[PDB]
Write a protein that binds this ligand. Structure first.
Ligand SMILES: *[C@@H]1O[C@H](CO)[C@@H](O)[C@H](O)[C@H]1NC(C)=O
Ligand SMILES: CCCCCCCCCCCC
Ligand SMILES: CCCCCCCCCCCC
Ligand SMILES: CCCCCCCCCCCC
Ligand SMILES: CCCCCCCCCC
Ligand SMILES: CCCCCCCCCC
Ligand SMILES: CCCCCCCCCC
Ligand SMILES: CCCCCCCCCC
Ligand SMILES: CCCCCCCCCC
Ligand SMILES: CCCCCCCC
Ligand SMILES: CCCCCCCC
Ligand SMILES: CCCCCCCC
Ligand SMILES: CCCCCCCC
Ligand SMILES: CCCCCCCC
Ligand SMILES: [Cl-]
Length: 545
């Protein structure tokens, strides 16, 4: 039937990129103006690049870096770029789990701390959400106060880091020990039975979706979600945000999907899996958007303010709307605990894969010194310890601004488009898209349609180059919560996080050419020839030519 096929592919597609990052990227970039670039990218590059990575991993049966060595010795810096991207992503991704852990620990009390505002941390300007319109120039929602006063202690700027938050630093330490202990002991990402690890994220999202839609203001919230704003499409930032949100959700350009495709058998219809997971992954983001944007629609009409100015246009929208929804539910504390466990399990499974993914790449990159045993176990703690210390810069009071620097630059924006363009450019134009079909038709049993070939050759490079060029032409500097202007050095620092991964592709080209000996034209020709990528006798494999 069809349920067994869904069971075989599990439910690991859902992550924090769906229930945390998508809603606020949609919220920041107007309303439904985010969806047109979202779907254009999803059907032009999103699914094609995802399937390309899977099928390259399956064809070469190699990891992130060695697969590119098999496909094309030149442009092999894509693996190193992916390693840098995933390292920065692991540095800034565990902070979300730190916030989730803090919220979960704060939810273990009789009265939710964000339900009412009469506490110590609360500005006198705060007023209850119900009484803002029921009955002093501006008032603040208790939910937003708790987020920027208790959880983040927001400082005036990034240049004022302030004293470290010892409560978040421990919550950051706990999730790193969990990542360290699980990876060191070889614990699977899904604990025990996979049913609870996969059905629970959907069950909680359905409950939140049901709660959101029945709220009185949900009608105006969805009209904000769905109906687009064309004048927003003039801005080239919405295309970048929507384009790389697909890449972030699919975990492509990270080297994760190549390794995921490696475990697939040679004769395996991975084409169906990429389409099925891709639609389910992007489908969850669309459906989860209905839940959160209904809450904002309810929040905006309750406070008598616009939907576009009711919450934070930045990370933590899922920490303002969702904790607000659980306040309007029977047994609010019970649902608050479950939500932040789900929000924590989703992130932990994603973090388990990437931290182990980059470590596996790192140890295999420099063997004879990181050999399996005492040396590797120390390396497991070394990667986490350094990633913990660098992650401490986003825990200070001015740590939200540093988090937005990493989020907008380190593993999103031009750095993800740079790799996605170069993965498609090498396969479609250098290796040959028609050549890959001969490999694919031998693998999945039938030659696919012209969609995949024409998406690597044309659609993805034009989308990545076009968005890259037009982002620089109409350059608007990064801003946090649409009111804070970053200092020049912060953007220069942020551009370095992107540029650190982007420079791997040209730098390895320079290294490779100088390593090779001979005339320059002979040198470039030698490094563009694949080194027998389909070299496996375990299954029936036709020679590349
Ligand atoms: C106060 O609320 C008004 C009306 O929504 C808004 O125009 C203004 O920017 C707010 N000012 C502050 C300080 O939040
Ligand atoms: C908005 C959806 C974009 C889908 C792109 C599909 C490309 C197919 C090209 C086939 C040409 C023969
Ligand atoms: C003047 C003090 C500025 C402090 C800004 C902190 C930025 C942290 C960057 C972390 C790079 C990995
Ligand atoms: C700028 C920080 C990451 C730089 C990575 C460079 C990798 C070069 C490896 C060359 C191997 C032949
Ligand atoms: C985040 C910068 C360091 C990440 C390591 C990249 C790979 C180095 C070995 C070639
Ligand atoms: C007031 C009811 C709004 C319903 C919106 C359309 C259904 C979305 C289901 C995901
Ligand atoms: C007072 C701010 C403390 C920030 C600590 C940052 C540690 C970075 C280690 C590389
Ligand atoms: C550096 C990449 C140049 C690609 C030129 C077109 C393909 C050449 C090999 C057939
Ligand atoms: C615009 C100049 C920026 C200089 C300070 C930031 C550099 C970060 C990498 C060391
Ligand atoms: C007025 C309808 C209440 C709905 C509560 C939703 C709990 C799952
Ligand atoms: C953010 C980088 C952490 C260190 C990774 C290990 C380098 C060999
Ligand atoms: C669902 C609309 C876009 C379909 C793209 C072509 C798939 C073969
Ligand atoms: C390639 C564009 C770099 C822009 C850096 C701006 C630093 C002020
Ligand atoms: C005035 C320069 C501040 C630099 C902060 C650290 C950047 C890595
Ligand atoms: Cl998504």
């Amino acid at each position: 039937s069809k349920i067994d096929f869904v069971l075989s592919v599990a439910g690991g597609f859902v992550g924090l990129g769906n229930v945390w990052r998508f809603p606020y990227l949609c919220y920041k970039n107007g309303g439904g103006a985010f969806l047109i670039p979202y779907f254009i990218f999803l059907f032009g590059s999103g699914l094609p690049v995802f399937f390309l990575e899977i099928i390259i991993g399956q064809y070469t049966s190699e990891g992130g870096i060695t697969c590119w060595e098999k496909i094309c010795p030149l442009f092999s810096g894509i693996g190193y770029a992916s390693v840098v991207i995933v390292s920065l992503l692991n540095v800034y991704y565990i902070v979300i789990l730190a916030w989730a852990t803090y919220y979960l620990f704060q939810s273990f009390q009789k009265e939710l701390p964000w339900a009412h505002c009469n506490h110590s941390w609360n500005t006198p300007h705060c007023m209850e959400d119900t009484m803002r319109k029921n009955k002093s120039t501006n008032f603040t929602s208790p939910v937003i106060e708790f987020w920027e006063r208790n959880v983040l202690s927001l400082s005036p700027g990034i240049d004022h880091p302030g004293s470290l938050k010892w409560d978040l630093a421990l919550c950051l330490l706990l999730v790193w020990l969990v990542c360290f202990f699980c990876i060191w002991k070889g614990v699977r990402s899904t604990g025990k039975v996979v049913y609870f690890t996969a059905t629970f994220p959907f069950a909680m999202l359905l409950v939140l979706l049901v709660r959101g839609l029945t709220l009185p203001g949900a009608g105006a919230g969805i009209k904000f979600y769905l109906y687009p704003d064309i004048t927003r499409l003039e801005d080239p930032q919405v295309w970048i945000d929507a384009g790389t949100q697909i890449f972030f959700s699919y975990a492509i350009c990270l080297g994760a999907m190549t390794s995921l495709g490696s475990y697939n058998k040679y004769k395996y219809n991975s084409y169906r899996d990429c389409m099925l997971l891709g639609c389910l992954n992007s489908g969850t983001s669309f459906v989860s958007g209905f839940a959160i944007f209904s809450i904002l629609g309810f929040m905006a009409q309750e406070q008598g303010v616009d939907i576009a100015d009711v919450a934070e246009s930045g990370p933590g929208l899922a920490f303002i709307a969702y904790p607000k929804a659980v306040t309007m539910m029977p047994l609010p504390t019970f649902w608050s605990i479950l939500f932040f466990i789900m929000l924590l399990l989703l992130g932990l499974d994603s973090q388990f894969v990437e931290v182990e993914g980059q470590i596996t790449s790192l140890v295999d990159l420099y063997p004879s010194f990181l050999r399996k045993g005492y040396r590797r176990e120390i390396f497991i703690a070394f990667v986490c310890s350094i990633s913990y210390l660098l992650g401490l810069t986003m825990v200070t009071e001015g740590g939200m601004y540093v988090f937005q620097l990493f989020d907008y630059y380190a593993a999103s924006g031009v750095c993800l488009l740079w790799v996605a363009f170069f993965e498609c450019f090498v396969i479609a134009w250098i290796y040959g898209g028609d050549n890959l079909y001969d490999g694919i038709e031998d693998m999945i049993g039938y030659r696919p349609g012209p969609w995949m070939k024409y998406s690597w050759a044309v659609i993805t490079p034009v989308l990545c180059v076009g968005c890259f060029i037009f982002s620089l032409v109409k350059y608007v500097p990064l801003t946090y919560n649409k009111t804070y202007v970053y200092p020049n050095w912060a953007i220069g620092l942020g551009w370095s996080l992107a540029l650190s991964s982007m420079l791997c592709v040209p730098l390895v080209i320079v290294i490779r050419l100088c390593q090779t000996e001979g005339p320059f034209l002979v040198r470039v020709k030698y490094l563009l020839t694949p080194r027998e990528p389909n070299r496996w006798a375990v299954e029936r494999e036709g020679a590349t030519p």
